[PDB]
Design a protein around this ligand. Structure first.
Ligand SMILES: [Ca+2]
Ligand SMILES: [Ca+2]
Lengths: 581, 246, 173, 44, 51
């Protein structure tokens, strides 16, 4: 019956959960799902039979844990919170609960039950963040090293992976996580090394052996410097920029119908190297499960698209009779690579969230495209019908209907092709009425001037509507999107920081063009103690929160009211006692 | 493991299993204790493995209970009258006894301890021998004595006399207010310690002050330790101030 | 200090017999610097005071938007230049048609006659296979390929959308 | 500075939370005294 | 005056309440407050914690 306080009270007074919970009991608890609830639908679609549903949701790639899962699935806030309060893996359980709740909410159709699930997920994320903050404050090494970078039973995935899947940016936004991430990002070098120092040392490899960089000793230092993920990132940035420069050089100058030249062959080798690197990333990051995980990242999808287009372009050009098609597809592929270049901006705090802002504004552009398509069809067809141009060729009709108004949106207003006062009258066609000869090349040989004032009126209305109303509707959508992801800029940047560090922490130390040799080279009681320490700190955190709650004004008022009621009762009792005697 | 706290064991010699494994006149610096033996009996019990040190009182018996009460009480009293090192230059080490349920023998133990002038704390709802005294402090008495304790010895008015004797020295007993799972009683310990001293000499209250500093019970310390009754000197507060700053 | 150093360099250059033009140029830049320095006096007024701080802060946003716009311009300009295959192909001209022309397109200067092929007169320009058109622009290349020109117009449409609205309004936000 | 601090402390003492805390503790004392006097009356 | 030294120590270790108390019974109240603000802002801008 969902009595959270009462179940807490009952368990408090000497009830052994281990001897209580039974498979039949758990089956009944799950059968207590409310009528046609989402969990009921999932159970029916899938004994409790709970493993299958969890594997379906997440991806499949101690009574307290079971009760917590049950409460989360049935969406009982208070009971879930209580069960978590006395679980085993507090932080991992909190992150897993947030993940599961967010997944179900996004999957739920209620549109308000989803709101409650999201709110519960936020509460769990906040609790996990606070608990981990306290753990980190107590002992940085213990918490950082072991709690996060540990594979639990929840999904056999590190806590950070759970946070990333749950998009629990607030979790990434705290001090301990960011300190650990920075330490990983700088590898063996001191995290306090100036950026300019690193950049300068990058082009002067001998210089690393000086006091400029802070950490036989020579080889150890050399490998520490060149293996640090930050150095790998800088090297990859340089190599990617050089690759784009080479691509542009070839495309603009060295591309000819003749067989490939030296530079073009170098570009082919470079692209093949990039393909090998992407294949390595996909194949080592359960083969089907790994492949699905790799394809789940947008940047990997962009890389695959770029490489596929490049391969098609090379194939087409090599064919005797497809040179132009190959060149065109290669131009588009270069555009794709240049857009992919944005991935490196995530390293910077100021440019990090801007990528997310652009990605979100693309959807608004899509919807505005719907609106603008409707309006352009209307106006363009109307104008084309009014003018009755004599070319009337289908490509020309599409031009004058869609393309010309679209440019009119951007200040390109061809008055000479629409106004008749600005065109010289001529006897163009035998058809009745008067005709004018526009000077434009693709404006039709001659247009009708019957009702031309109406064309100008439509032009005025279109200018107003398009250039102001619709464009500023789109801009208002952009402003709203920007503001939405501006108050949380830091959170987005921290999440991007984690993604970037994870990507570059497991990459070969050599930049792509030379990465071929690296690819060839490629070809317990402690946990008990750690969990006990975590549980102790969880108990301290809960006790502190309860102490604060007891000191709240509402609690003081309640307590004093009940206490003074007791005092009044005792006063009546003593008055009666005095009366008797 | 979550870290210092030390646990001390006081059990009768005769209810510990595998005693013969612990007999060596020439020295027993090494020793192996089989604390997970399959057989189980209601007389012999296995030693815990979490305690840093054990004390086995020998009463010349092959198994019984209550053979350590007198020695334990004497040791606690001696601790209550001992300074924290540096001879007399240190300060008195506070002591108190926590009671959780019990029986008539436990009630007698509590009475002996109170007559020894050692603070005792009782927990409400623990069960017999503990909740009864808590109710008596809060406040039919005979009915409660029979109710909160099993039928045996309930008719025995010796229990009533023991309860009256406990009440005679209620200045030391203190009840534990659950307060709906309060799980917070540092203030209660300090309150018991202060109410169990009375005499104000400014040389025996330093330990309570150090405890208050170690905790965040500033209000308690101000109410009692710095209520003006005691004559606090200058050098007295130097160490406490340093601790508070750190 | 910057203004005075530029002024000193300009005077020195002009006094030299063979650096008159360089001296004049650096002096023009130095005058620009002095005129900008003139803003310091607006701080006396309450209404114009904070505006200087606002401009100074908006400069950083301009810098980051320059990063974004550089990426997008490189993409679009290289794509278009590859598609057109202009026969001038001179490095300064390539840089012009890659960076400068799209940048002006951001501000309503759209040279249709230099990109659309329907607006250019077809001619037999070069022996290379395929059809070619002769743009009228002076720096638009002697003649451009018209193989896949609809794609050039599509890229122009996409660039107009993205640059003139999405990125500019990101900066404005 | 002393005047300013004293004024701020005076304002703090008059805050609603402080009044509630003070009245709660004071009425706890009153209840304790009421129990004390009830026991005294019971004895006599 | 020990108060100035204690105030500096509290500011450096970033103990809010103790710093406030030490300032409450310092010598140069206004100058000390401004100096504390200066020092705290400098350290914060220099600190890597981000919280
Ligand atoms: Ca990739
Ligand atoms: Ca004492």
């Amino acid at each position: 019956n969902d009595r959270p306080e009462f179940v807490r009270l009952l368990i408090s007074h000497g009830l052994s959960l281990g001897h209580f919970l039974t498979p039949m009991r758990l089956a009944q608890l799950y059968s207590a799902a409310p009528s046609n609830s989402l969990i009921r639908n999932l159970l029916d679609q899938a004994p409790p039979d709970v493993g299958h549903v969890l594997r379906m949701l997440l991806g499949k790639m101690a009574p307290w844990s079971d009760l917590l899962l049950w409460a989360l699935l049935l969406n009982r806030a208070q009971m879930a919170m209580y069960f978590w309060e006395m679980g085993s893996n507090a932080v991992s359980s909190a992150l897993g609960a947030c993940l599961l709740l967010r997944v179900m909410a996004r999957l739920e159709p209620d549109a308000e039950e989803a709101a409650r699930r999201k709110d519960l997920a936020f509460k769990f994320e906040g609790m996990g963040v606070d608990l981990f903050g306290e753990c980190y404050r107590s002992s940085e090494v213990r918490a950082a090293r072991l709690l996060l970078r540990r594979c639990p039973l929840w999904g056999d995935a590190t806590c950070l992976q759970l946070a990333m899947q749950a998009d629990a940016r607030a979790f990434f936004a705290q001090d301990g996580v960011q300190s650990l991430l920075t330490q990983k990002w700088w590898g063996d070098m001191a995290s306090t090394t100036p950026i300019w120092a690193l950049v300068l040392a990058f082009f002067c490899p001998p210089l690393i052996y000086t006091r400029l960089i802070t950490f036989r000793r020579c080889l150890r230092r050399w490998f520490h410097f060149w293996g640090a993920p930050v150095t790998i990132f800088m090297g990859n940035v340089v190599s990617y920029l050089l690759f784009l420069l080479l691509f542009s050089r070839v495309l603009l100058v060295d591309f000819q119908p003749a067989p490939p030249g030296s530079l073009e062959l170098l570009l082919y080798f470079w692209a093949f190297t990039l393909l090998c690197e992407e294949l390595r990333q996909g194949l080592s990051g359960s083969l089907s499960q790994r492949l699905r995980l790799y394809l789940a990242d947008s940047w990997n999808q962009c890389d695959l698209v770029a490489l596929t287009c490049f391969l098609l372009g090379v194939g087409c050009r090599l064919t005797p009779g497809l040179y132009h098609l190959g060149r065109t597809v290669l131009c588009i592929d270069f555009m794709v690579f240049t857009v992919r270049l944005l991935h490196i901006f995530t390293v910077n705090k100021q440019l990090g969230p801007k990528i997310v802002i652009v990605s979100k504004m693309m959807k608004d552009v899509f919807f505005f495209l719907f609106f603008l398509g409707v309006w352009l069809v209307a106006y363009g067809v109307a104008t084309e019908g009014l003018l009755r141009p004599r070319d009337s060729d289908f490509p020309s009709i599409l031009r004058r209907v869609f393309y010309r108004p679209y440019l009119q949106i951007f200040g390109q207003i061809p008055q000479e092709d629409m106004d008749v006062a600005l065109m010289e009258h001529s006897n163009c066609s035998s058809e009745p009425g008067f005709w004018a000869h526009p000077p434009g090349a693709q404006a039709g040989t001659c247009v009708s001037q019957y009702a031309n004032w109406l064309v100008v009126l439509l032009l005025v209305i279109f200018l107003l509507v398009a250039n102001i109303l619709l464009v500023n509707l789109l801009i208002a959508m952009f402003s709203y999107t920007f503001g939405k992801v501006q108050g949380n800029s830091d959170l987005y940047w921290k999440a991007q920081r984690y993604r970037l560090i994870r990507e570059f922490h497991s990459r070969p130390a050599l930049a792509p063009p030379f990465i071929v040799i690296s690819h060839l080279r490629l070809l317990k009681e402690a946990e008990r103690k750690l969990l006990t320490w975590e549980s102790v700190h969880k108990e301290n955190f809960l006790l502190a929160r309860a102490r604060d709650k007891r000191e709240s004004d509402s609690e003081r008022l309640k307590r004093t009211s009940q206490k003074v009621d007791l005092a009044l009762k005792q006063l009546g009792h003593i008055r009666e006692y005095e009366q008797r005697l | 493991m979550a870290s210092k706290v030390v646990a001390m064991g006081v059990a009768p010699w005769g209810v510990v299993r595998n005693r013969d494994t612990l007999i060596n006149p020439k020295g027993s610096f090494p020793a192996r204790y089989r604390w997970r033996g399959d057989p189980e009996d209601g007389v012999q019990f296995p030693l815990d493995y979490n305690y840093s040190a054990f004390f086995l009182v020998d009463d010349g018996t092959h198994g019984c209970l209550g053979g350590e009460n007198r020695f334990r009480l004497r040791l606690e009293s001696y601790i209550s009258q001992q300074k924290t090192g540096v001879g007399g230059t240190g300060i008195d080490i506070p002591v108190l006894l926590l009671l959780i349920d019990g029986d008539e023998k436990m009630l007698t133990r509590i009475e002996n301890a109170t007559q020894a002038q050692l603070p005792c704390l009782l927990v409400a709802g623990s069960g017999g021998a503990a909740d009864c005294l808590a109710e008596t402090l809060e406040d039919q008495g005979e009915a409660r004595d029979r109710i909160r304790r099993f039928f045996p010895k309930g008719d025995l008015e010796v229990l009533q006399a023991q309860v009256e004797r406990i009440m005679t020295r209620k200045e030391l007993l203190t009840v534990y207010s659950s307060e709906d799972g309060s799980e917070e009683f540092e203030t209660i310990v300090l309150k018991a310690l202060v109410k169990a001293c009375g005499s104000s000499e400014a040389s025996a209250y330093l330990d309570e002050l150090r405890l208050a500093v170690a905790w965040n019970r500033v209000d308690i310390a101000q109410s009692e330790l710095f209520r003006g009754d005691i004559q606090w000197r200058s050098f007295h507060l130097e160490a406490s101030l340093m601790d508070a700053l750190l």
